[PDB]
Design a protein around this ligand. Sequence first.
Ligand SMILES: CC(C)CCC[C@@H](C)[C@H]1CC[C@H]2[C@@H]3CC=C4C[C@@H](OC(=O)CCC(=O)O)CC[C@]4(C)[C@H]3CC[C@]12C
Ligand SMILES: CC(C)CCC[C@@H](C)[C@H]1CC[C@H]2[C@@H]3CC=C4C[C@@H](OC(=O)CCC(=O)O)CC[C@]4(C)[C@H]3CC[C@]12C
Ligand SMILES: CC(C)CCC[C@@H](C)[C@H]1CC[C@H]2[C@@H]3CC=C4C[C@@H](OC(=O)CCC(=O)O)CC[C@]4(C)[C@H]3CC[C@]12C
Ligand SMILES: CC(C)CCC[C@@H](C)[C@H]1CC[C@H]2[C@@H]3CC=C4C[C@@H](OC(=O)CCC(=O)O)CC[C@]4(C)[C@H]3CC[C@]12C
Ligand SMILES: CC(C)CCC[C@@H](C)[C@H]1CC[C@H]2[C@@H]3CC=C4C[C@@H](OC(=O)CCC(=O)O)CC[C@]4(C)[C@H]3CC[C@]12C
Ligand SMILES: CC(C)CCC[C@@H](C)[C@H]1CC[C@H]2[C@@H]3CC=C4C[C@@H](OC(=O)CCC(=O)O)CC[C@]4(C)[C@H]3CC[C@]12C
Ligand SMILES: CC(C)CCC[C@@H](C)[C@H]1CC[C@H]2[C@@H]3CC=C4C[C@@H](OC(=O)CCC(=O)O)CC[C@]4(C)[C@H]3CC[C@]12C
Ligand SMILES: CC(C)CCC[C@@H](C)[C@H]1CC[C@H]2[C@@H]3CC=C4C[C@@H](OC(=O)CCC(=O)O)CC[C@]4(C)[C@H]3CC[C@]12C
Ligand SMILES: CC(C)CCC[C@@H](C)[C@H]1CC[C@H]2[C@@H]3CC=C4C[C@@H](OC(=O)CCC(=O)O)CC[C@]4(C)[C@H]3CC[C@]12C
Ligand SMILES: CC(C)CCC[C@@H](C)[C@H]1CC[C@H]2[C@@H]3CC=C4C[C@@H](OC(=O)CCC(=O)O)CC[C@]4(C)[C@H]3CC[C@]12C
Ligand SMILES: CC(C)CCC[C@@H](C)[C@H]1CC[C@H]2[C@@H]3CC=C4C[C@@H](OC(=O)CCC(=O)O)CC[C@]4(C)[C@H]3CC[C@]12C
Ligand SMILES: CCC1(c2ccccc2)C(=O)NCNC1=O
Lengths: 49, 71, 631, 138
Amino acid sequence: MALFFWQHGEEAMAKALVACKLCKAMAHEASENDMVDDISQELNHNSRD
Amino acid sequence: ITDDELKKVHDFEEQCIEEYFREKDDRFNSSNDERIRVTSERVENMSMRLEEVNEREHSMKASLQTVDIRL
Amino acid sequence: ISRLEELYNTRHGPSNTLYHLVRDVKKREYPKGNLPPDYRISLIDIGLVIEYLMGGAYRCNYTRKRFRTLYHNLFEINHFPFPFHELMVWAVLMKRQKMALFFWQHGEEAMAKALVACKLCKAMAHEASENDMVDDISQELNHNSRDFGQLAVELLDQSYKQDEQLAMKLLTYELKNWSNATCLQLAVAAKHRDFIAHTCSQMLLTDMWMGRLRMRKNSGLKVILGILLPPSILSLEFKNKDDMPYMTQALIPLGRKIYEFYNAPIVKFWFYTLAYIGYLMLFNYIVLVKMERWPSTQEWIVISYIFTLGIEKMREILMSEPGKLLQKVKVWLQEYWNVTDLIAILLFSVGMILRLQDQPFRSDGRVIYCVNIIYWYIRLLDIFGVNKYLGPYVMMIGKMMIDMMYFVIIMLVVLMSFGVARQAILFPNEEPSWKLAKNIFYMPYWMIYGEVFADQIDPPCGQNEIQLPPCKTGAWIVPAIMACYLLVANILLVNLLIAVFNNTFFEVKSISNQVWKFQRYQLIMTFHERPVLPPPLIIFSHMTMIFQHLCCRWRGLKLFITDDELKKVHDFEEQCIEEYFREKDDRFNSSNDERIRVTSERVENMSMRLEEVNEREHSMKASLQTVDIRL
Amino acid sequence: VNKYLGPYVMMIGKMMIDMMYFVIIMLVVLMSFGVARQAILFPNEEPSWKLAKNIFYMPYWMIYGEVFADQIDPPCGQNEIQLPPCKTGAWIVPAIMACYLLVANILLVNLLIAVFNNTFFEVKSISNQVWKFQRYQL
Ligand SMILES: CC(C)CCC[C@@H](C)[C@H]1CC[C@H]2[C@@H]3CC=C4C[C@@H](OC(=O)CCC(=O)O)CC[C@]4(C)[C@H]3CC[C@]12C
Ligand SMILES: CC(C)CCC[C@@H](C)[C@H]1CC[C@H]2[C@@H]3CC=C4C[C@@H](OC(=O)CCC(=O)O)CC[C@]4(C)[C@H]3CC[C@]12C
Ligand SMILES: CC(C)CCC[C@@H](C)[C@H]1CC[C@H]2[C@@H]3CC=C4C[C@@H](OC(=O)CCC(=O)O)CC[C@]4(C)[C@H]3CC[C@]12C
Ligand SMILES: CC(C)CCC[C@@H](C)[C@H]1CC[C@H]2[C@@H]3CC=C4C[C@@H](OC(=O)CCC(=O)O)CC[C@]4(C)[C@H]3CC[C@]12C
Ligand SMILES: CC(C)CCC[C@@H](C)[C@H]1CC[C@H]2[C@@H]3CC=C4C[C@@H](OC(=O)CCC(=O)O)CC[C@]4(C)[C@H]3CC[C@]12C
Ligand SMILES: CC(C)CCC[C@@H](C)[C@H]1CC[C@H]2[C@@H]3CC=C4C[C@@H](OC(=O)CCC(=O)O)CC[C@]4(C)[C@H]3CC[C@]12C
Ligand SMILES: CC(C)CCC[C@@H](C)[C@H]1CC[C@H]2[C@@H]3CC=C4C[C@@H](OC(=O)CCC(=O)O)CC[C@]4(C)[C@H]3CC[C@]12C
Ligand SMILES: CC(C)CCC[C@@H](C)[C@H]1CC[C@H]2[C@@H]3CC=C4C[C@@H](OC(=O)CCC(=O)O)CC[C@]4(C)[C@H]3CC[C@]12C
Ligand SMILES: CC(C)CCC[C@@H](C)[C@H]1CC[C@H]2[C@@H]3CC=C4C[C@@H](OC(=O)CCC(=O)O)CC[C@]4(C)[C@H]3CC[C@]12C
Ligand SMILES: CC(C)CCC[C@@H](C)[C@H]1CC[C@H]2[C@@H]3CC=C4C[C@@H](OC(=O)CCC(=O)O)CC[C@]4(C)[C@H]3CC[C@]12C
Ligand SMILES: CC(C)CCC[C@@H](C)[C@H]1CC[C@H]2[C@@H]3CC=C4C[C@@H](OC(=O)CCC(=O)O)CC[C@]4(C)[C@H]3CC[C@]12C
Ligand SMILES: CCC1(c2ccccc2)C(=O)NCNC1=O
């Protein structure tokens, strides 16, 4: 859904960089709060995408 | 930058998004794996339509032989 | 039973090494010898064969008293409840790989069957290499072991993909048809390194490590703060009462919190580590400071540590897997650290007995203490082996010693040649004395490490400065051969060992990572079975257990799941097998090679049918032309 | 700020973490040889803080080409001026010296050479990207 919404609308570069920041931040927060490690890996993958 | 240049960079960003998406589509359509898959499938269908063509050609040959026998 | 005995006694099909295994277990059981040619191999002997190959405390269902009673009374009671299991074992034993792979797909408990097959294949490969058979048989058996291991790894991947918790239940549940074992225990008994180093089993081992503590964030430090400060335990977050209870045998909240904390294996390990570090500094204090006639309080604490640790090592020997004590010792000798610990305990006992006497034996006991202090420092590498960076480093050093040994041998040859040449030129009138070997080995060995002994390279002699003693004949060869020795030592051999250590780095690093991830299980289950109290206070837990044993005489961390959950894990295991097989079929059908081949063929046929179509179209065109000419 | 020296400093920064484990194993082996040598060669010492200095002093300089050749195997228990008598078990002091000098100078340093070389390429690429990243911060 995020990749679909990235295509539509303006300011796609800032939207992509903000999404990469948010994904890395929630990956770090999920690793810090002792959640499932697969969630942190998938959030890091979304940040890299 | 101003509203005018904002409109310009928004147009630039949309051209960049369309060019990137359809260049990815061109790369995917020209890869060896997708070409082999599309071919394989196309070939699969061909044979099936040509087997139908062979059966209908046998029927047409039998009809032509019967018409030649009648006349 | 009779049909399976006839299957085990067949002579058709490919060759096998089963007869050698039956001969070896018959020679071991009744020390006879070679079997008669007309020998009918009973399934009891197959049971002993399975027990010998699987090793440890494995007890095949054939050798149990129920099956021997059924055998004595008969040679649906004679029908096997799980026939695919015995068929699988039959196939794996007589080296029919495709039949075993077919029987792996059909039936339940496919994971335990695959791990047992990998164990059996590796064991017969080792036995075929030991008995000097054909090496191709050993290679093919190792290939079959690796194929069954890859099957189990892919099944584990599918179980982790579908549902996590029921996959843990698959990994932990007791296998009644496999000597009451566990899939994890079978993956460790078969030395399956890829199975244990998988991320699911690693986090299972991490969950097993932490006991009943949630924690998992900056771990180790809060464990140490709980150890050193007993009122720091109540601030730690504790897991639920029923969230993952791995056990072996299936006010008050404060006492439950204390009991759950102090029985956690990480807390028990850090207890043992702090007690060990305290013992090491108490050993340092008694060896640096002078020793009186009687031992001090610190020496008494060190002696108490050594002897309680010795009784604890004897406890690890007695509470082991086999039933016969020689096999218990043979199992315990696999861990080399335990053997060197026992040797160090005996050496400290000899040193203490020599120290408690008078001179000149007290100094000898002090010296034996000073040699033991070296090993008790070196044991900190195994203590640090629990770390995810230091453990593989220690394993890597272990691999690198074997590469160093050949350098040591070539080094010894060149060093001994230069030592013999220098001592035999510069000293031409010596007498038979043991100082000649010391003069051979002394100077060249320190020549390696930056000390060339510059005062004695080419000393000025045969001149008056005080008159120097005359020159020994041929002494000028002593510098020149020195030059050669210093080159081959310092620029050739050390640089070659640098290249050896660097080129064997990557493979040894990956193997050290997998072996550390494998022996994490061994660390966890050894430290779960250990008593709560540290080694200096372990005598209390030991008398406690001795009194409990006497009271009982007067009167694997599994899950022990039920028939219902057994049905659930069997359904899960069948979904995993079907998903893995048809995902392999999807991968094979979507590969480029198979698509190109299927196309090529389809095209081949097309042309042939279209050539027939062209000929029939020519015939139809001729018929239409004739019909148009007629009308 | 330089395009050659900056990644070199970042690379040294990465290499310190690889050095730390060598330092730990080095500390264990060095402390064992220091305790053994001080506790054999000095059997009548008193509680004093010089014992730790004698533990840490000689083995650490033994790593860097100074084996202290005058004090490896000093001649004693003989008349030359009469030398003081031999300490008991002093012949173990050279032999364990041999082992310590091997594991220090041919095993551990060569292993750290291999560690630094095998982690060179990835750390070099990461140092290049981190330098190019922190150019903005500069
Ligand atoms: C679990 C680990 C990380 C910490 C626990 C170990 C320390 C608390 C121990 C180990 C060595 C001990 C020392 C060993 C020897 C001595 C000499 C001892 O002095 C004497 O016996 C003579 C002088 C006097 O009686 O005061 C005083 C205690 C002290 C410093 C000890 C203090 C406590 C130490 C530091
Ligand atoms: C279990 C061990 C390995 C680690 C935990 C540390 C403490 C529980 C122990 C170990 C060393 C012990 C010390 C060793 C030596 C001494 C010297 C001792 O001094 C005397 O006995 C001198 C006076 C006299 O002669 O009566 C007093 C106890 C003390 C400080 C001990 C206090 C308790 C310590 C710190
Ligand atoms: C103070 C002087 C005498 C120097 C002491 C040198 C040796 C007594 C030490 C130094 C480094 C040690 C090695 C460091 C690493 C390892 C790997 C480790 O091996 C394993 O973990 C595999 C064995 C197993 O656990 O089954 C322990 C043995 C070994 C070779 C050690 C053997 C003893 C060594 C050679
Ligand atoms: C990598 C390979 C080639 C290493 C091989 C070296 C060792 C076999 C040599 C090198 C230095 C030798 C030691 C040098 C000096 C001594 C002291 C010597 O002590 C005595 O003779 C007692 C009286 C005295 O000290 O004068 C006993 C032999 C020993 C330990 C030697 C034993 C053999 C050693 C360890
Ligand atoms: C070929 C390589 C692999 C090994 C070479 C080993 C040498 C270093 C050994 C083997 C024979 C040894 C000799 C065999 C016999 C003796 C007599 C022995 O005489 C005594 O002990 C007499 C009483 C005394 O003075 O103690 C002194 C050592 C010596 C010269 C040995 C010195 C060391 C030698 C030359
Ligand atoms: C694979 C490598 C590491 C094996 C190396 C083995 C040998 C090279 C070592 C092991 C035992 C050593 C011996 C142990 C004890 C002695 C007694 C020592 O005797 C003296 O020094 C006599 C007193 C004196 O006059 O100094 C001479 C060296 C020698 C033969 C050593 C020579 C070197 C030896 C044969
Ligand atoms: C890797 C390359 C660069 C090595 C080249 C080094 C050699 C060519 C040199 C280094 C040390 C030299 C030796 C140093 C000392 C002497 C003793 C010297 O003896 C005498 O003059 C006899 C009387 C006396 O000893 O005073 C004869 C030459 C020689 C063997 C030299 C020969 C040439 C050597 C072997
Ligand atoms: C004169 C004697 C006391 C020797 C001095 C040794 C140390 C004080 C120096 C020598 C090399 C230095 C290191 C060289 C390179 C780096 C990388 C550099 O790290 C970074 O750029 C990352 C940190 C950041 O900027 O966020 C600065 C720290 C460090 C580890 C340095 C830390 C301090 C070290 C160990
Ligand atoms: C890679 C790892 C294993 C390195 C570990 C080595 C250090 C922990 C050691 C090695 C040399 C030691 C030093 C050697 C000598 C001294 C002088 C000493 O000074 C005094 O005692 C003052 C009076 C005097 O100088 O006599 C104080 C300790 C110190 C700095 C020592 C502190 C600890 C050091 C730095
Ligand atoms: C196990 C490894 C990781 C660490 C080992 C550390 C040792 C090198 C330490 C720990 C205990 C220390 C001892 C603890 C107590 C004392 C008493 C202390 O006595 C005094 O200070 C008395 C007054 C004076 O003479 O200054 C002298 C140092 C000493 C022997 C310490 C020397 C250094 C020791 C052996
Ligand atoms: C990861 C690595 C680098 C950590 C290394 C830490 C220790 C090995 C160092 C850090 C602080 C050092 C201590 C700092 C100061 C001293 C006092 C010093 O005291 C004296 O020399 C007393 C005066 C004299 O009689 O010489 C003895 C060494 C010692 C204990 C040092 C021993 C080595 C220590 C414990
Ligand atoms: C002596 C070392 C140790 C130990 C401690 C921590 C980790 C591993 C081993 C112990 O203190 N007692 C039981 N077993 C042992 O060998």
